[model samples]
Target: PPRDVIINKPYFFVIIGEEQYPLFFGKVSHPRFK
Candidate 1:
């Protein structure tokens, strides 16, 4: 993974089909939120 690809925690989520369902979520255990 690259630094640019490291997603921050509490990441925003998107939905589809006019609704949302849980799915595989990305992560950054030690994220940089600065």
Candidate 2:
């Protein structure tokens, strides 16, 4: 299943299992979003 992949390890991120995939890697730039 290794087709197209996104770099998330080095950035400290993880994908959700049977839930949601969030990008909790770096800091949030916009104040409205975090």
Candidate 3:
């Protein structure tokens, strides 16, 4: 069975030239930290 996952963290982003990008774009799990 699949386990339920949740994200309760703030998103990190960057701006380059005039475009913005997300550091974490998809499903992610931090092993050591939340």
Candidate 4:
């Protein structure tokens, strides 16, 4: 029974010590994209 994971849009989080932490944060650059 080890089911623990979260999926945040445009971002990633990791589960450690039963807590969520930013592992590889996302970044939408400015000027926008077509």
TM-score of each candidate structure, all chains considered together: 0.20, 0.20, 0.20, 0.22
Model 3 quality (TM-score): 0.20
Error of 2 at 34 (Å): 15
| Model 2 C-alpha lDDT versus the unseen true structure | 0.51
Taking the tens digit of each residue's C-alpha lDDT, what string does model 3 give over 1-34? Answer: 9988665674444444534555444443453553
Clashes of 1: 0
Instruction: Give candidate 1's TM-score.
Output: 0.20
> Over the stretch 1-34, how does candidate 4's per-residue lDDT look in tens digits?
9987654445433544545565444554343467
Question: How many clashes show up in model 2?
Answer: 0
Candidate 3 stretches greater than 4 Å from native: 1-9, 18-34
User: lDDT by residue for model 2 over 1-34, one digit each (tens)?
Assistant: 7799765444444556666767454543333433
Q: Regarding TM-score, does 2 or 4 come out ahead?
A: 4
lDDT of each: 0.53, 0.51, 0.50, 0.49
Candidate 2 clashes between residue pairs 3 or more apart in a chain or in different chains = none
Which has the greatest lDDT? Answer: 1
Identify the superior model by lDDT, candidate 1 or candidate 4: 1
Q: Candidate 1 lDDT, tens digit per residue, 1-34?
A: 6556654455655444545664544544565679
Poorest stretch of ten by lDDT in candidate 4: 7-16
Candidate 4's TM-score: 0.22
